[PDB]
PDB file of C-alpha atoms in Angstrom:
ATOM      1  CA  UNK A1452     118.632 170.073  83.471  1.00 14.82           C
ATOM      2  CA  UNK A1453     115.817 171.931  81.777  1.00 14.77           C
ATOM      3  CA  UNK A1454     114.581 175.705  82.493  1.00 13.53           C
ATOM      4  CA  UNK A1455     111.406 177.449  83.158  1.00 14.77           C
ATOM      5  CA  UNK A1456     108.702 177.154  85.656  1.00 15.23           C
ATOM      6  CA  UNK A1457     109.412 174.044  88.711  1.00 18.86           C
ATOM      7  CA  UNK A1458     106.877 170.995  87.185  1.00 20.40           C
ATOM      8  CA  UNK A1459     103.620 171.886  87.499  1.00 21.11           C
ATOM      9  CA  UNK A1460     102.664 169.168  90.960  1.00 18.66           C
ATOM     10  CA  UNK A1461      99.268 169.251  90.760  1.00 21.36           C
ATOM     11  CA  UNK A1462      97.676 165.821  88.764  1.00 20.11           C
ATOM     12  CA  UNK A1463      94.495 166.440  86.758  1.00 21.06           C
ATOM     13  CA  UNK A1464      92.572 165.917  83.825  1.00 19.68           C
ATOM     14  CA  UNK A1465      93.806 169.086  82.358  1.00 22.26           C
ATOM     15  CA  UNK A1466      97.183 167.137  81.791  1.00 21.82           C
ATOM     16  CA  UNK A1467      96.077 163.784  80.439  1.00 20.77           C
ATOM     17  CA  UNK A1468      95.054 165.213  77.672  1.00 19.96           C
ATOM     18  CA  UNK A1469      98.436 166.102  76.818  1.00 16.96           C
ATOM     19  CA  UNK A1470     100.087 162.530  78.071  1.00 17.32           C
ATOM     20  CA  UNK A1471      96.861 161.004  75.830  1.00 12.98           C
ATOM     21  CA  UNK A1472      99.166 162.401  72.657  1.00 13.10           C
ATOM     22  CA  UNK A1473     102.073 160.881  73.854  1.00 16.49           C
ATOM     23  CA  UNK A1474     100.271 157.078  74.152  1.00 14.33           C
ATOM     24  CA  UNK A1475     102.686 155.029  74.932  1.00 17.31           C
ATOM     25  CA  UNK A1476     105.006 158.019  75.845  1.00 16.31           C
ATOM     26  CA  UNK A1477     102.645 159.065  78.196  1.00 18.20           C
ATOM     27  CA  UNK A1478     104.051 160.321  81.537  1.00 17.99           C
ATOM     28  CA  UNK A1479     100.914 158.816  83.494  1.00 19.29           C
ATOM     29  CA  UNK A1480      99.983 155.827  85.208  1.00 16.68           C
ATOM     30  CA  UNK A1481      96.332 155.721  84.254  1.00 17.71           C
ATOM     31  CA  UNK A1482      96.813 157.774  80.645  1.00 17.71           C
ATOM     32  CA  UNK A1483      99.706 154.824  79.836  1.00 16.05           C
ATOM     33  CA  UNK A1484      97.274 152.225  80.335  1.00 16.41           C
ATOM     34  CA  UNK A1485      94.681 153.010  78.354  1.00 17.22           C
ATOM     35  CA  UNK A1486      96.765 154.448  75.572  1.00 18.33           C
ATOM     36  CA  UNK A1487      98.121 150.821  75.303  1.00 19.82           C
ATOM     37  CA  UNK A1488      95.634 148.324  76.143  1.00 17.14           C
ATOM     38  CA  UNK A1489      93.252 150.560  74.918  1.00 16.45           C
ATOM     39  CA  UNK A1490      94.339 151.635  71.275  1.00 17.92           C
ATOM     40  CA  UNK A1491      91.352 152.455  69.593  1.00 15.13           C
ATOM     41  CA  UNK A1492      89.942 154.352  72.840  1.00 17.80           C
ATOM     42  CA  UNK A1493      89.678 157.982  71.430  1.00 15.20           C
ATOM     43  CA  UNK A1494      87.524 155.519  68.705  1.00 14.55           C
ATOM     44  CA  UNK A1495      85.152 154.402  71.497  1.00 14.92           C
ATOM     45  CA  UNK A1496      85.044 157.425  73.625  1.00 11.54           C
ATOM     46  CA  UNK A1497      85.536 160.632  71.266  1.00 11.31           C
ATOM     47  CA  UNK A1498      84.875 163.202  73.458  1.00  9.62           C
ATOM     48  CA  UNK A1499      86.989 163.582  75.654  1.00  8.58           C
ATOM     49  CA  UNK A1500      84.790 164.615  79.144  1.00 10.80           C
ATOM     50  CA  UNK A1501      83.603 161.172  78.227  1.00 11.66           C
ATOM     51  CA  UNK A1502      87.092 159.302  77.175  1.00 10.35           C
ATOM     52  CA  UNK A1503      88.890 160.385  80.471  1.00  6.97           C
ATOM     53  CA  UNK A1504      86.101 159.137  82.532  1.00  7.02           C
ATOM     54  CA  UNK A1505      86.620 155.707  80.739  1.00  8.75           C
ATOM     55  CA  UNK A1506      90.641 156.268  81.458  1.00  7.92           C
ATOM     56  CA  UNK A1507      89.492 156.161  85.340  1.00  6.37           C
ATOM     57  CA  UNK A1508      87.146 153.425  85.255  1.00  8.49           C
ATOM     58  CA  UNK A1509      89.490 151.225  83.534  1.00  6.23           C
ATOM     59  CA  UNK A1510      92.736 152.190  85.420  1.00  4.25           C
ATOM     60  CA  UNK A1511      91.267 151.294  88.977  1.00  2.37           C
ATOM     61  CA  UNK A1512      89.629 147.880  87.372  1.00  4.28           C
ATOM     62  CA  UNK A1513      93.178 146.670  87.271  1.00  5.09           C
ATOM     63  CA  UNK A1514      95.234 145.581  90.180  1.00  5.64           C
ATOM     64  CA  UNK A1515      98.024 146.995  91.684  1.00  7.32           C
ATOM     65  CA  UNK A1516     100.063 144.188  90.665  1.00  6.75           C
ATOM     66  CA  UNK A1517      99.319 144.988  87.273  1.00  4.74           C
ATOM     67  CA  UNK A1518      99.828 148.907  87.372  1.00  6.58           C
ATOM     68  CA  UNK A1519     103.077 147.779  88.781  1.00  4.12           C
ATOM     69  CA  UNK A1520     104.816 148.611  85.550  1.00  5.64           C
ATOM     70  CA  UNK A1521     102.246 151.164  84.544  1.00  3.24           C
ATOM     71  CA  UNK A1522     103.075 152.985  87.426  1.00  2.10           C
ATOM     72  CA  UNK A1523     106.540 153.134  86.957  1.00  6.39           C
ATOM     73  CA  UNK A1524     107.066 153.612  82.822  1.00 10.74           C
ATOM     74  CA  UNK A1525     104.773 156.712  83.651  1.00  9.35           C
ATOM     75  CA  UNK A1526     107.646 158.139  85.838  1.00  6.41           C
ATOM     76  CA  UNK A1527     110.202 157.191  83.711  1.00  9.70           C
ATOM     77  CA  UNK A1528     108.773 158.588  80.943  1.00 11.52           C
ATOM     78  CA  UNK A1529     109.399 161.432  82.189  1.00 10.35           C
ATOM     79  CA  UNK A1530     113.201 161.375  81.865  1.00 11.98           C
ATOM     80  CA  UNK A1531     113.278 159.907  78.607  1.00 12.05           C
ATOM     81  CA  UNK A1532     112.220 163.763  77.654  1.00 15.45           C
ATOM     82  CA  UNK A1533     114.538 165.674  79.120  1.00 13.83           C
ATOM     83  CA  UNK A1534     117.223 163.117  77.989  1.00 14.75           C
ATOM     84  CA  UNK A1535     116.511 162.631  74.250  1.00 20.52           C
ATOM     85  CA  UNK A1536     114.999 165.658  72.082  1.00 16.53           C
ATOM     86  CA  UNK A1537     118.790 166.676  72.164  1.00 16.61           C
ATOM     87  CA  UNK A1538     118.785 169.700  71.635  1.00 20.73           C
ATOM     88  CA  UNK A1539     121.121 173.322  71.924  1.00 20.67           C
ATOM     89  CA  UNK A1540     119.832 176.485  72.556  1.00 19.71           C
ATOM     90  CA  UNK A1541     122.035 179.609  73.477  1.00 18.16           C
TER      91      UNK A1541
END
């Protein structure tokens, strides 16, 4: 277990931008998707007040069938941090 500040809850553009670093690391259902199917997307959409919007449109074109695994990679993500990035700090 981690320390700090509990998660920020709160979901909004303010943290995509981080999970759009992350690609296929990122801890988002939506900001997953697009960082896979859509590699070249920071290409098409540079800016990003203009990319995000494109992150939306996209995400609820697809079916919940097919966010399925989206959905869930996003959460597990997640873990994957606070598991690896071993690290020791006194």
């Amino acid at each position: 277990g981690s320390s700090g500040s509990s998660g920020n809850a709160q979901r909004s553009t303010l943290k995509w931008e981080k999970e759009e670093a992350l690609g296929e690391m990122a801890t988002v259902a939506p900001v997953l998707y697009t960082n896979i199917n859509f590699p070249n997307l920071k290409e098409e959409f540079p800016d990003w007040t203009t990319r995000v919007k494109q992150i939306a449109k996209l995400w609820r074109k697809a079916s919940s069938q097919e966010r399925a695994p989206y959905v869930q990679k996003a959460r597990d993500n997640r873990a994957a941090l606070r598991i690896n990035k071993v690290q020791m700090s006194n």
